[PDB]
Nucleic acid binder design. Structure first.
Lengths: 104, 343, 117
DNA sequence: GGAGGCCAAGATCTCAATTTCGTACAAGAAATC
DNA sequence: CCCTTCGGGAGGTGCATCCCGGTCTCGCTTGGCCTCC
RNA sequence: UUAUCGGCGAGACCGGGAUGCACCUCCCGAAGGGUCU
């Protein structure tokens, strides 16, 4: 029934190039697993949370070499935490989540 | 006449370091990076090759044997040929046609030269780089500070005569004055280089010769100091080395190796295992290695290699596995028909 | 020596097990006279006056150095969220703050250094 | 004996030489799957 | 509730190779000669 | 667009040798204490 007028489609695409993103929010992942929480690993998540702010700065997306290197390193340093979740079902859910992130 | 691939790992019992001119910069001693600036560092295959070549040279020297006084028959030119492959007499021609078929006899009678070639003769042995397996397996070590002995310990003052304590007082005052001078001139030089950053390309050269003027003035304030040329007290900049226990994958090939050449190579491995020191920094005991190699051979036309055996070098000993490695070592030991005094 | 290779190489000490390292020392230097009052009885009244002017000046230096460091670390947060090549001017500012701190230190008569530190 | 194919011969000549390098940021809105 | 320390001294030199070895062609016709129809 | 259409092509290992190493102690100063069946 509806028709679509995307006024200012130039900015639409330009920021679509941002919207082509899924924010793996470590605070959200920290908040998501609040019962199966290997709290010792939080430091790693906290250290990575610092690094993102250092590379990302004030940008929602930043193309310095650090960003992809930190992306791989963060998920490897999260794979370290992957062997810390105690509940096996939660561990596999976490493993599958990062695996989906890893393959994506 | 078969190809031997030593594929294996070097475990670093002590930190492993090297100083390659291109690798190092104004920052300090830094390992080569295996690519760009931030690439994972690797230990040069050149350092490993040189260490094993000098080990093999010592092996050949011992095998030929030393006269009563302890001297080796080899000429100085022969020592350089065997261990570094430089013809000091300059009689090595690169593409002289007549040595085209003398290469086979030269290799047969000089297994070391066949193994480690020379200028004009291809070396059958290719000693590859050692690349770490894991990440963050390197670091800055050796950071230090030379300190006045008589200020760290006062009991050494009672050993100095009056004129020598006065000498130490003149030296300390010259060091403090030199320091204040070189420090104010380097604290103007560093801001002058922090202005060279935003520099008009032409002005690059002018600020550069300003930097070289300041450097000449630092070197004349150093040539002015009477008591000492270099200040005794100083921080030693650390060097970059592979961490202790770092596992570095290593790959060495002996292309078309005869039994006796591979035997000489294994003897070189053993004699290097007597002192498993790679790279440098012999002070701080850097370079000590525990390396294990799987020797695999590959008959051309075969689809799979055959693992002849393993060469394990540990601080507790050298373990050789496989009958073939023993056979090659024995063949090298028992072949009396080698001549190294003649290239 | 310089140019003569030393035959001795003294390796690094590598711990065998995990752990086996931690923070030692710590603690804090203190004012003797709040630790033991008996030393008041050795010091003359003029020296008691000097010690109490020393306490008051150390404590006022403390509070004002403290608020200073507090704005300094809020500025360090600004630097942690500043841009590239704009932080070098804030760093000149920080070095100036530092100089100022060291001058505030200098002009504190004898007890230039915080005692109860 | 005629018709295809391979190969050697035929006159001297007309004209000029680079010398690597891009590009250096901001924020619009949000019940996100 | 205190209160986070000053500094000191940042190298000296070496040495930067030798040598190869840089192509055929062909843009047209024509007959002489050598084999096949 | 002063006409019509025309792949330029075929072959080559550039390789052969070298340890970058040689010297440095980073140390010196300190009680964190008092407070509550």
């Amino acid at each position: 029934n509806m028709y679509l007028i995307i006024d200012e489609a130039d900015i639409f695409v330009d920021m679509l190039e941002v919207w082509k993103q899924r924010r793996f929010n470590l605070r959200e992942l920290t908040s998501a697993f609040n019962e199966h929480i290997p709290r010792n690993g939080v430091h790693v998540i906290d250290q990575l949370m610092n690094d993102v702010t250092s590379i990302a700065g004030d940008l929602h997306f930043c193309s310095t070499p650090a960003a992809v290197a930190l992306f791989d390193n963060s998920f490897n340093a999260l794979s370290k935490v992957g062997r810390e979740i105690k509940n096996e079902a939660a561990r596999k859910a976490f493993f599958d989540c990062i695996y989906s992130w890893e393959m994506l | 006449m078969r190809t031997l691939n030593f594929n294996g790992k070097i475990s670093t019992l002590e930190p492993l370091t090297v100083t390659v001119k291109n690798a190092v910069s104004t920052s300090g001693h830094r390992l080569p990076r295996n690519g760009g600036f931030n690439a994972a560092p690797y230990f040069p295959g050149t350092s490993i090759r040189g260490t094993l070549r000098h080990a093999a040279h010592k092996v050949i020297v011992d095998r030929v044997g030393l006269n009563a006084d302890g001297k080796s028959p080899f000429d100085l030119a022969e020592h350089f040929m065997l261990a570094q492959g430089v013809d000091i007499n300059g009689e090595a021609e690169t593409f002289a046609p007549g040595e085209i078929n003398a290469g086979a006899e030269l290799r047969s009678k000089n297994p070391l030269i066949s193994l480690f070639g020379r200028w004009g003769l291809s070396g059958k042995v290719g000693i590859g780089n050692a690349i770490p397996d894991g990440d963050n397996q390197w670091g800055m070590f050796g950071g230090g500070a030379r300190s006045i002995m008589f200020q760290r310990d006062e009991s050494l003052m009672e050993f100095l005569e009056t004129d020598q304590v006065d000498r130490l007082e003149r030296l300390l005052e010259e060091q403090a004055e030199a320091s204040v001078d070189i420090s104010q001139i380097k604290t103007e030089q560093d801001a002058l280089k922090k202005a060279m950053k935003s520099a008009d390309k032409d002005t690059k050269a002018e600020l550069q010769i300003k930097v070289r003027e300041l450097d000449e003035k630092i070197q004349a304030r150093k040539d002015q100091k009477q008591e000492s040329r270099e200040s005794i007290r100083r921080p030693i900049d650390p060097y970059e080395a592979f961490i202790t226990g770092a596992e570095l994958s290593h790959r060495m090939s002996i292309k078309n190796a005869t039994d006796e050449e591979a035997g000489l190579f294994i003897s070189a491995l053993i004699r290097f295992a007597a002192e498993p020191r790679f790279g440098g920094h012999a002070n701080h005991n850097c370079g000590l290695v525990e390396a294990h190699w799987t020797v695999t051979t590959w008959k051309p036309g075969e689809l799979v290699p055959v693992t002849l055996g393993e060469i394990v070098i540990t601080p507790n000993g050298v373990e050789i596995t496989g009958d073939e490695l023993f056979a090659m070592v024995k063949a090298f030991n028992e072949n009396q028909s080698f001549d190294f005094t003649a290239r």
